[PDB]
Amino acid sequence: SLIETADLRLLLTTVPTETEALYLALAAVEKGLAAEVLITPVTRVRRENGKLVVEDVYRLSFKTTRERLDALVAWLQRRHPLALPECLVLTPIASSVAYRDWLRSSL
């Protein structure tokens, strides 16, 4: 059944090529830093060095416990290929108790 939750955060990040996307996701999951990772193909249009640029990028969504959050974000920022790593966190207010127990067990 649905229960209120507060230990879940959603980390949003994008990278140029789907390779390093799946690599970062794989490295995080294999060592248990992030047990839930998703990838999507996206197009990014940014103002770079004063100029607008069009590019196709790949977005990463990471959900993990707040206790493991600091280690994961530190590992990212030191390991993120861009010297200016992406860090956006969103917290869901509730979820099924089944995921509460499972993710607690799997994280």
Partner 1 sequence: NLAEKMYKAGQIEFAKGNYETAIIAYTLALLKDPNNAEAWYNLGEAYLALGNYEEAIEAYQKALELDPNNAEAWYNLGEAYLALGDYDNAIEAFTKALELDPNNKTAKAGLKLAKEKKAL
* Smallest separation (angstroms) from a copy of itself to the CB of 79: 14
| Total binding residues toward a copy of itself, as defined by CB under 8 A | 50
Q: Which is nearer to a copy of itself, 17 or 74 (CB)?
A: 74
Site string for partner 1, 69-88 (x = CB under 8 A): --x------xx---------
Query: Among 20, 36, 68, 75, which residue sits at the site for a copy of itself (rule: CB under 8 A)?
Result: 36
* Number of Cα atoms under 13 Å in the Cβ half of residue 105: 6
Phi and psi angles of residue 23, each rounded to the nearest 5 degrees, phi first: -65, -50
- Are the C-beta atoms of 24 and 60 separated by less than 8 Å? yes
3-class DSSP state of 2: strand
